[PDB]
């Protein structure tokens, strides 16, 4: 459902 518009910043 959700996309990397969750994090993605590869931490």
């Amino acid at each position, epitope marked *: 459902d*959700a996309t990397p518009e969750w994090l993605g910043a590869r*931490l």
Partner: antibody
Amino acid sequence: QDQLQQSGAELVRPGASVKLSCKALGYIFTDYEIHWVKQTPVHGLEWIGGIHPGSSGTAYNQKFKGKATLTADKSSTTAFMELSSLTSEDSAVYYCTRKDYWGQGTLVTVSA
Amino acid sequence: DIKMTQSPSSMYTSLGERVTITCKASQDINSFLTWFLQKPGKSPKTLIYRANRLMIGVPSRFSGSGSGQTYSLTISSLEYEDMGIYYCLQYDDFPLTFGAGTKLDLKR
């Protein structure tokens, strides 16, 4: 699908170490960060840190830099969190999260 | 270090009632926030991500809003199932931080 499954409760001795795991299912593991959160009655929720399985990138809560080590394994889509030199202060429920999904948590009791 | 101020801290409610919970970030967090509920002895369950997008499977009576430093979670009509503690999480910047939460309580 889409899910996070954590390992069972741990009963460790002070001064020892323990390594927790978080199995990811139903989604592309190397596309989302996996973060670990600590919860205790007294201190509430505390973000420990995160890891990007796709790039091995990590970020820690300064308070845990040197205490917690986060690793990830692509072949078993499992994120790991290791804690060293444990004290009763480390007794808590530990969660892994993709920020939307949360694991069911792992209870860690530090006692002699 | 972004501080999330959640309010109210305690909520005295009645079923069917409309409930609004608020979280203010000590700085702009660009809608990178989630709302989750946690029941006693149970693990967290997300209701909203990115300030106003419903998690699949979450009932529509739950909705989120806000854009800069102020975000609200609205429960259109409280149900028994909704009791527990609500929290907000900002992930616009490390370290991720949480609001102190708000206990939802059935008034009598």
